[PDB]
Design a protein around this nucleic acid. Structure first.
Ligand SMILES: [K+]
Ligand SMILES: [K+]
Ligand SMILES: [K+]
Ligand SMILES: [K+]
Ligand SMILES: [K+]
Ligand SMILES: [Mg+2]
Ligand SMILES: [Mg+2]
Ligand SMILES: [Mg+2]
Ligand SMILES: [Mg+2]
Ligand SMILES: [Mg+2]
Ligand SMILES: [Mg+2]
Ligand SMILES: [Mg+2]
Ligand SMILES: [Mg+2]
Ligand SMILES: [Mg+2]
Ligand SMILES: [Mg+2]
Ligand SMILES: [Mg+2]
Ligand SMILES: [Mg+2]
Ligand SMILES: [Mg+2]
Ligand SMILES: [Mg+2]
Ligand SMILES: [Mg+2]
Ligand SMILES: [Mg+2]
Ligand SMILES: [Mg+2]
Ligand SMILES: [Mg+2]
Ligand SMILES: [Mg+2]
Ligand SMILES: [Mg+2]
Ligand SMILES: [Mg+2]
Ligand SMILES: [Mg+2]
Ligand SMILES: [Mg+2]
Ligand SMILES: [Mg+2]
Ligand SMILES: [Mg+2]
Ligand SMILES: [Mg+2]
Ligand SMILES: [Mg+2]
Ligand SMILES: [Mg+2]
Ligand SMILES: [Mg+2]
Ligand SMILES: [Mg+2]
Ligand SMILES: [Mg+2]
Ligand SMILES: [Mg+2]
Ligand SMILES: [Mg+2]
Ligand SMILES: [Mg+2]
Ligand SMILES: [Mg+2]
Ligand SMILES: [Mg+2]
Ligand SMILES: [Mg+2]
Ligand SMILES: [Mg+2]
Ligand SMILES: [Mg+2]
Ligand SMILES: [Mg+2]
Ligand SMILES: [Mg+2]
Ligand SMILES: [Mg+2]
Ligand SMILES: [Mg+2]
Ligand SMILES: [Mg+2]
Ligand SMILES: [Mg+2]
Ligand SMILES: [Zn+2]
Lengths: 89, 118, 42, 44
RNA sequence: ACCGAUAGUGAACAGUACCGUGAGGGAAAGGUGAAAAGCACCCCGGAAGGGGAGUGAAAUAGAACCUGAAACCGUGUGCU
RNA sequence: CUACCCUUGGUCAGGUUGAAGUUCAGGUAACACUGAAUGGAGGACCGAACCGACUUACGUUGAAAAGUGAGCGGAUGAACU
RNA sequence: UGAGUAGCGAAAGACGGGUGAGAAUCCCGUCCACCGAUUGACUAAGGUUUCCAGAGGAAGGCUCGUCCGCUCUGGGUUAGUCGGGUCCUAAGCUGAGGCCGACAGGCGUAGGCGAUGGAUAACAGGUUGAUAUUCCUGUACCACCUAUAUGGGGGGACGCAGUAGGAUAGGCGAAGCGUGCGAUUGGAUGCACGUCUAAGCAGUAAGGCUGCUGAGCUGUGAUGGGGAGAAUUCGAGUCGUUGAUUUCACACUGCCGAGAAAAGCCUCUAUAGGUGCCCGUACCGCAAACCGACACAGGUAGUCAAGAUGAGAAUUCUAAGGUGAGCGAGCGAACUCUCGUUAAGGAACUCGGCAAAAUGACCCCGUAACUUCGGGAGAAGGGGUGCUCUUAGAGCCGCAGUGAAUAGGCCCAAGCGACUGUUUAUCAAAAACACAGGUCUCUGCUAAACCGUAAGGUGAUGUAUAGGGGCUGACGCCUGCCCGGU
């Protein structure tokens, strides 16, 4: 279940500053809670989690040509480790 | 005298601003009618500077704006007028400015001119 | 207040007889070999 | 001037929403009519 | 011995867009070419757009692309 | 939207007037009665916010399918929200 | 076609510098101007990516555009404590059984849902292009976990007005300290700013109530932070005055119209370690992003509330902060509109003094008929305001002294309506409606009346000093004749 909870890492300027501060940003399944996120990270990466922050992103308006629709809604989790680190390369 | 499309107070403020700008920069670009009024305002200020007494200085301060001018020295517009400009025009009897037409502006067709100290 | 009849092409063009612009007043500039408005500076 | 439409999320959903339509026989008739016409939107 | 894009379904590309608090109302919009061979390259231009050169049977078939009527808008002038 | 209502909230710069009571003083056989102070009532008064819309000017292919400028009515109440 | 015509949607801009193919219109700067009980700041609804960065200029922008709430690409919203849910109930909605009804369905008991109300644990500082009581730093608190050590009662719990106080916030002044600055215009050696720091935790405490409560203060929190400042280190937190619209607190007094519920809560039958979910969080927000077809002079709930002047949140100029309004340049004709002035006269204008003018603040004199004894009344009509000096006088100046702005015109008489109030959203605000008061009439309670087919309801958790209906319309004096007809 844990590898379903964690979808992908998020790579941005703000996420990179977070990684400099030992915070790792993941896109997670939109149904899971932050406790599940913490358990999944601990299990997958064999690290210790200090805290997990979470937020939702609404669908964003997007178009190509005459077709206007929306992107997928997102759930973003920021995981603060107390022990260890995660190698994304 | 011209009205320049402004009320009395607006016109007076704009003429003071233009005269002080001309004193600071020695050459400005504006509209023809504005320059044709600014020439009289600026020449009377220069006359006051050539007089150079305390009363003439205070009368000039009635009209000039309070703009600092920065060899790292610093002086006010009134100081420049009663110093450098007056000394340069000690021997000339009027006609301290000249207007040079340049042609219409793109945005509104206004006749642009350059008015400069001679 | 409103036109009683439509304006014919003939009448419209007759009215527009004087609706035109004029070539500007221009003179040759000696040094640069170009043109400018008379009594204006480059 | 104060106009007639003063939007209100709660009022809109409570008066014109799916559950309000479901709650009455005539509301279900509305939903059936819109499904028959092929509407993309059935309710508020 | 039905229609042929104002016809025929409202809809040849839509119960969409849009309108309405809502029930509900409800469009417009088809066609390059046989084949994309959809204009390498040069020139003016910031671009847009053009002129060449090329492709093509044909480019006033260059995509707002078959045919291209009329209203309407221009340029030239034989008579007045 | 609007009319009325239900439940639950909120708002009203400042001036002015001075009801009932009370107390003290006169006064009585006992009450009535009177003056001063105190007191702070009122769909009270003047007037901002706010709520209106009386007059007038402007606007009348509007800035606006009912508005704007200047005055104007109410403004602790059957108030406004 | 009208026609290069009307319009381009309230207003102050100017110049220098830059960018660029192109600049009145973009960026930077200086000066100027406008708002400032707000054109400032913060919540809510509503909108829903409009937010940020880089790039772009076809179309949108009432001009232009190098710019944008527009286009392209990539980003941005972090919570045990904030608001909501895992708590409570109001109106209302719904409703197991049940009652009623051609059908469909209507009603309703227990119960349930349902904030606009009740309960409930976190503060200060720092930081980004875009989030922050959410991230970070420091210091806390709450619930639960692990280890060492059910009935009763109370309460919650409530209106409106007014008054006297305590405290604090805030304002002002002296400069006590601190930081700067110290002036080429005649003169002086003075000019301008700063003067703080939370929750929590201990001690205490003006008051209030009949021991319980209680604003606030002190210390700690804090060799931390923030600071007018000097070149990463160093830097002041003091005296007086005024004083709330905040809080003690609906505490106290008074009044009639007599002012939720339920749960949480109360009462009677320590330390240590660890855990703490979901939803919202971007941005606009009295608006260019909401409702008005618009980048529309309209509408849109609450909060914060500086100085001078003043009774004031009025007036005028300013502070904090924000803004110069998405067409301009000339000219200075008629005419239109909005403003200012005007000889002599002064309503001769006109349906009508319509409009305008005049009055206007504060202080002191003074004030009629009539009256329901309250009023009328700010009746009317008159005086005084500047500045300096002495302690009410003496002086000084102007045409003028509330020298600006803001601030009742008044009187006499008549109709109607007693009065405050209400009305034809959008041509009528009135003499119309209402009204307190009067009278008539119905109604003995499963009342009459009203809604509904009914059940069920309103009347009313009322009971003839009550409820419904008709007419009249304060108050004073009064309200005559006719019962043949309806
Ligand atoms: K209410
Ligand atoms: K919202
Ligand atoms: K002219
Ligand atoms: K009766
Ligand atoms: K009879
Ligand atoms: Mg969250
Ligand atoms: Mg002129
Ligand atoms: Mg003026
Ligand atoms: Mg055809
Ligand atoms: Mg068809
Ligand atoms: Mg052809
Ligand atoms: Mg063709
Ligand atoms: Mg207020
Ligand atoms: Mg009153
Ligand atoms: Mg009033
Ligand atoms: Mg009305
Ligand atoms: Mg008005
Ligand atoms: Mg009155
Ligand atoms: Mg035309
Ligand atoms: Mg013309
Ligand atoms: Mg014409
Ligand atoms: Mg004209
Ligand atoms: Mg015009
Ligand atoms: Mg404009
Ligand atoms: Mg504002
Ligand atoms: Mg932006
Ligand atoms: Mg344009
Ligand atoms: Mg964009
Ligand atoms: Mg029911
Ligand atoms: Mg922000
Ligand atoms: Mg925000
Ligand atoms: Mg919109
Ligand atoms: Mg607007
Ligand atoms: Mg508005
Ligand atoms: Mg309002
Ligand atoms: Mg004001
Ligand atoms: Mg605009
Ligand atoms: Mg006169
Ligand atoms: Mg006269
Ligand atoms: Mg007279
Ligand atoms: Mg007459
Ligand atoms: Mg006459
Ligand atoms: Mg009048
Ligand atoms: Mg006054
Ligand atoms: Mg009346
Ligand atoms: Mg009235
Ligand atoms: Mg009307
Ligand atoms: Mg009217
Ligand atoms: Mg009557
Ligand atoms: Mg009889
Ligand atoms: Zn030349």
């Amino acid at each position: 279940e844990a590898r379903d909870i964690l979808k992908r890492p998020v790579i941005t300027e703000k996420s990179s500053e977070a990684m400099a501060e030992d915070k790792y940003t993941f896109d997670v399944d939109t149904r899971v809670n932050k406790t599940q996120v913490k358990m999944a990270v601990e299990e997958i990466f064999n690290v210790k989690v200090a805290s997990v922050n979470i937020m939702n992103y609404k669908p964003k308006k997007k178009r190509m040509g005459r077709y206007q629709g929306y992107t997928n809604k997102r759930r973003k989790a920021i995981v603060t480790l107390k022990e260890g680190s995660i190698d994304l390369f | 005298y011209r009205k320049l499309g402004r009320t009395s107070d607006q016109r007076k403020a704009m003429l003071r601003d233009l005269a002080t700008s001309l004193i600071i920069s020695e050459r400005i670009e504006t509209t023809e009618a504005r320059a044709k009024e600014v020439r009289s305002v600026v020449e009377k200020l220069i006359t006051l500077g050539k007089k150079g007494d305390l009363a003439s200085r205070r009368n000039a301060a009635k009209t000039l704006r309070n703009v600092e001018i920065l060899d790292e020295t610093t002086q006010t517009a009134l100081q420049k007028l009663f110093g450098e400009i007056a000394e340069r025009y000690t021997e000339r009897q009027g006609g301290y400015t000249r207007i040079l037409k340049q042609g219409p502006r793109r945005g509104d067709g206004a006749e642009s001119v350059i008015i400069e100290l001679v | 207040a409103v036109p009683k009849r439509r304006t014919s092409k003939t009448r419209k063009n007759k009215r527009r007889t004087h609706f035109k612009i004029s070539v500007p007043g221009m003179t040759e500039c000696p040094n640069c070999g170009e043109y400018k408005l008379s009594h204006r500076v480059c | 001037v104060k106009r007639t439409y003063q939007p209100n999320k709660r009022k809109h959903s409570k008066v014109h929403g799916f559950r309000k339509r479901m709650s009455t026989k005539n509301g279900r008739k509305v939903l059936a009519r819109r499904r028959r016409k092929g509407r993309k939107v059935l309710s508020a």
